């Protein structure tokens, strides 16, 4: 019964800010990788990071890299993303979801949360 | 257990009393292969086996002949000549917790 | 890949007895009529039991069957070589429409 | 074909030597009652000849 | 001397709308119920649909049901299936054959017909 | 990057196929992973690895790698599968790579 909640799609003004949360529950969540991708109005999906279990390694695509941060918190169950230097280029639908498995990597799975809304 | 590692107790040498099972209104599931379930005690055999193991409610029409799926293949595989029965229960009381 | 469980096979020596079993729910055995046919590949299925134990014309008496609890079976006795085939049990599902079970090959 | 000759196929029990039973009434095979009619595992007990 | 004949047994693309024929003779047409039976290749008999003699009630078979369509014509002695939306799961040996008795119906009995091969 | 046809169609008994293309080091040398989006929720995963399903995910959806391209092969086409699907794949010299998606309607 996996499920994964997303919160903060609210409106924000160009070169600002905005941090995202995802809480999630129904699996292991300390020993997980998890992802966030975006889906831009018109456009298909576009992966933005990943940080894995144990923070050994985070990715971000180029056009979020140096600009976005991608943090967990291990203790509360819960996925944050940081998006700085905001643009209009940014507006997506933002999803929060799972790798396949424990330890490993590679690409957001099987288990997706609804996602929520970002408007820049 | 869990089902990745199943516990298998052997049964010898002693009076097997099915009616203790087949009577009982806990169980939901009671799927008898190639013997009938209300017969049990008219029949003598050498060997019971009994695999013991706790799946999801969805998994548990993996647990036949002729079955397949990540329960059927990777955990817990049964022979399509299986002879016996598959007997389960709901244990959300008892294999569950908050969190 | 069916409702109506039977083994892949079966086997013995002419001139003896085998069974083939057949198991399923109450919505298929339980509260219903159970029918055996018997394939002999090269040509079409034919009926051999009906009504759980009836035979009809044209089959003669080393075959017979029955039905009790939730299961049902098949006996055949005197093999012959000529009864290599494929038997198969099937009957009304209370849910579903019509089930047949996987098939069982008899050989000699 | 003619077809106008029956022969009973379905009985409750067999003939007693020289019995008659001339009756239409219809057989259940199955445990389900037919209410005296005709359907889900019953049939008139009388066959035609081709 | 009961007899069934089945006819359209040929390679047909999925996209089509193949339609088989029964002949019947040896019996009474109008006061039997029929069924059709396949055999798909490397498995044993699948059930496909009944049509009782008054046309009073039909079943299928949940994986063509509501795809194909069973009809029959009491004064041609012939029963017709109609199957559309073709899948190569489809591929099997067609039988035709009848019930025990008049009136009533449950299974295919005693007298089934050679068949013909369907190719999808 | 990776490159798929923006649409696909049939009539209900039509197989029908979904490609994908990119680089060495987008199909060639890693594994080729396919989603399935049904519009008014999230995407979900369909294909991994190449040709493993997860669960929930029946055997009416297949696939395979070869080369430096892959491919989804979709057997059925009901009023339940009309999804946008996508290809993705990890880059040795991108991050996670995402092809533009194909819309599958039937």
């Not at chain 1, 169950?77 to 700085?84: D, E, I, K």
């Not at chain 2, 029409?61 to 022979?79: E, F, S, V």
């Not at chain 4, 009985?11 to 030597?17: D, E, F």
């Amino acid at each position: 019964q996996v499920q994964l909640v997303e919160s903060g799609g609210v409106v924000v003004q160009p070169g600002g800010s905005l941090r995202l949360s995802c809480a999630a529950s129904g699996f292991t969540f300390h020993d997980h990788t998890m992802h966030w991708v975006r889906q831009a109005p018109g456009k298909g999906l576009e992966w933005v990071s990943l940080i894995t279990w144990n923070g050994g390694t985070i990715h971000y695509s180029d056009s979020v890299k140096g600009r976005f941060t991608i943090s967990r918190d291990n203790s509360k169950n819960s996925l944050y993303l940081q998006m700085n230097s905001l643009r209009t280029e940014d507006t997506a639908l933002y999803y929060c979801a799972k790798d396949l498995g424990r330890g490993g990597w590679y690409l957001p799975s099987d288990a997706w949360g609804q996602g929520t809304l970002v408007t820049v | 257990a869990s089902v990745y590692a199943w516990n298998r107790k052997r049964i010898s040498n002693c009076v097997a009393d099915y009616s203790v099972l087949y009577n009982s209104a806990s169980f939901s599931t009671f799927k008898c292969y190639g013997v009938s379930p209300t017969k049990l005690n008219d029949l003598c055999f050498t060997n019971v086996y009994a695999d013991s193991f706790v799946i999801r409610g969805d998994e548990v029409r993996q647990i036949a002949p002729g079955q397949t799926g990540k329960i059927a293949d990777y955990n817990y595989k049964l022979p399509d000549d299986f002879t016996g029965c598959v007997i389960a229960w709901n244990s959300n009381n008892l294999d569950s917790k908050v969190g | 890949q069916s409702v109506l469980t039977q083994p892949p096979s079966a086997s013995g020596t002419p001139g003896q007895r085998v069974t083939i079993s057949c198991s399923g729910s109450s919505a298929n055995i339980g509260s219903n009529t159970v029918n055996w046919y018997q394939h002999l590949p090269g040509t079409a299925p034919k009926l051999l039991i009906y009504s759980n134990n009836q035979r009809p014309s044209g089959v003669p008496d080393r075959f017979s069957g029955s039905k009790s609890g939730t299961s049902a079976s098949l006996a055949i006795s005197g093999l012959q070589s000529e009864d290599e085939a494929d038997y198969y049990c099937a009957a009304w599902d209370d849910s579903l429409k019509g089930v047949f079970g996987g098939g069982t090959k008899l050989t000699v | 074909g003619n077809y106008n000759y029956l022969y009973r196929l379905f009985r409750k029990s067999n003939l007693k030597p020289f019995e008659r039973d001339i009756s239409t009434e219809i057989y259940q095979a199955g445990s389900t009652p037919c209410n005296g009619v005709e359907g889900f595992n019953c049939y008139f007990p009388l066959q035609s000849y081709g």
